[PDB]
Amino acid sequence: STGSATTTPIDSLDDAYITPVQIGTPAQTLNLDFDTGSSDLWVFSSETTASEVDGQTIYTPSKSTTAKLLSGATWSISYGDGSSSSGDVYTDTVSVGGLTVTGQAVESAKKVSSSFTEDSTIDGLLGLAFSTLNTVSPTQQKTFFDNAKASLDSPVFTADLGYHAPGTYNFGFIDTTAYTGSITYTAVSTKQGFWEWTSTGYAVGSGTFKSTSIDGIADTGTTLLYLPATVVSAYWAQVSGAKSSSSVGGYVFPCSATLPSFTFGVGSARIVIPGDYIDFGPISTGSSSCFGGIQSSAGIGINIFGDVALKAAFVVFNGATTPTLGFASK
């Protein structure tokens, strides 16, 4: 089997991407944030505290003939940005882009933090990291990908995120028309439950490539590119007037600037992030200070290849017995 679904930016900055997902019978379509940095499929629901729902589409398990309470199961998750959600669990039929899983754990939110309430465009998350990170207790649950894997033509999914444009998540096949050149594969460590890999270095603009190992995670659920302070300082040093602002919460730059590209290494291959991808616009409406798309990971504890980086590539998440990650230009 295979699946193919379009993913669409939620706003003009590509702050996140939403992908339609069919849950239950008859289908209830919710727009979920596919997140390769977590492993819970959770939804706004008929159980979500009413004051914490503001425009989202909800899953109502009582309207699904295939929903069943997973008795005694609860879940609670905290994300790197300080957001959180929690609740109980149903099993139901879930389909993505024509690919159907029966008995998928659908985590129904009873509570969500303010960041989720305030984002009317995101109806929940679909985790695509390793199932060892799933938060369901007392019986940990499998991700959609893990449940689908054995039925897939090939045990893979791919992320092809757009810059200010829709893109695609495919399951079970590699679309050889969606990228240019060849795919370079690189080793993954699953020890922390993430798609964790080691980049071979970086360049700033037209500068020379610096060969250096950068361990980090491929995380579709994180907007920006978070790298070591040394690397980030080297990048922003090439933008006149750029500075790290503790009041804003990271590097800012004059909105009048032309940003240089940023290149990262995948083995002997190179992925170029155009400068425009690194512009996140005015810090507040009308400001001439703009927010940077490359930020320091210092104090996160991990480097994060978020959307800024991933959208410059066609990315293969290979879930074979020995997992790997593939990157191609596009």
From Swiss-Prot:
Keyword hit for Signal: yes
Taxonomic superkingdom: Eukaryota
GO annotation (BP), single: proteolysis
Domain Peptidase A1: 17-328
Active site: 35, 199
Top-rank EC class of the record's enzyme: hydrolase
An annotated Gene Ontology molecular function: aspartic-type endopeptidase activity
Disulfide links within the chain: 255-290
Keyword NADP: no
Reaction it catalyzes: Hydrolysis of proteins with specificity similar to that of pepsin A, prefers hydrophobic residues at P1 and P1', but does not cleave 14-Ala-|-Leu-15 in the B chain of insulin or Z-Glu-Tyr. Clots milk
Keywords, ordered alphabetically: Aspartyl protease, Disulfide bond, Hydrolase, Protease, Signal, Zymogen
E.C. designation(s): 3.4.23.22
Similarity comment: Belongs to the peptidase A1 family.
Protein name: Endothiapepsin
Residues included from the entire protein: 90 to 419 of 419
